[PDB]
């Protein structure tokens, strides 16, 4: 699996760009793919979403008509159309893969990202109050506004780790399930509004910024980020 994406650069305000996400190594047509961005030094932010079969499309409240998301399954690429770029659109845009069925792990793969630079409500807010903290145990926390536990029994809370130089990787999906490839050191827990992630024994490869995410209802809001140093 790999998601190579391109099509970003210096843009004059009010112009337009088209991003691409070239996917290889997985069954593209059965994955619903998102675009996630983060400002040069700030946290991640959700942008859009297109479903498998292209029947469900969602956008952020900040790109509701400016942007346009579309996919080409036979050509196996994902496109995002951007119009009337403003200065709040300076960010690195990530291509994310997500499949939805019983037991699946959404958001399990993230592309390397593309950089775009622009020259000079009633939605769930999640806050990570801590902003900073080998062989010890750390207990990164998180909080939400509305309860994330649904009537299904699921608690749609996701944990991502962004190492200092690359794209986020999924660590825990739905508050308790360790993703494929994550060591047994990581574990997650929570109650509906307050959550925590536990690293039982650190390593030099566990340093970075920990981000949370809710999938309970669109838009997908993230949280500021917890730094480990």
């Amino acid at each position: 699996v790999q998601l190579v994406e391109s099509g970003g650069g210096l843009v004059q305000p009010g112009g337009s760009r088209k991003l691409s996400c070239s996917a290889s190594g997985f069954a593209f047509s059965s994955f619903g793919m998102h675009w996630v961005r983060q400002a040069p030094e700030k946290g991640l932010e959700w942008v859009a979403y297109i479903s498998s079969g292209s029947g469900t499309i969602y956008y952020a409240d900040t790109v509701k008509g400016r942007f346009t998301i579309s996919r080409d399954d036979p050509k196996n690429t994902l496109f995002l159309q951007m119009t009337s770029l403003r200065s709040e659109d300076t960010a690195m845009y990530y291509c994310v893969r997500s499949i939805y069925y019983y037991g699946s792990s959404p958001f399990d793969f993230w592309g390397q990202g593309t950089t775009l630079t622009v020259s000079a409500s009633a939605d769930i807010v999640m806050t990570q109050a801590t902003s900073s903290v080998p062989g010890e145990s750390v207990s990164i926390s998180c909080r939400s506004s509305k309860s994330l536990l649904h009537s299904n029994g699921n608690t749609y809370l996701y944990w991502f780790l962004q190492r200092p130089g690359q794209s986020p990787q999924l660590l825990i999906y739905r508050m308790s399930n360790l993703a494929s490839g994550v060591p047994d050191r990581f574990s997650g827990s929570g109650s509906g509004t307050a959550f925590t992630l536990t690293i039982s024994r650190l390593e030099a490869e566990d340093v970075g910024v920990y981000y949370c995410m809710q999938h309970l209802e669109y838009p997908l809001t993230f949280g500021a980020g917890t730094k480990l140093e």
Partner: peptide, 8 residues
């Protein structure tokens, strides 16, 4: 094989 890194 139900659970593959690829989606199929």
């Amino acid at each position: 094989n139900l659970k593959t890194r690829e989606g199929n």
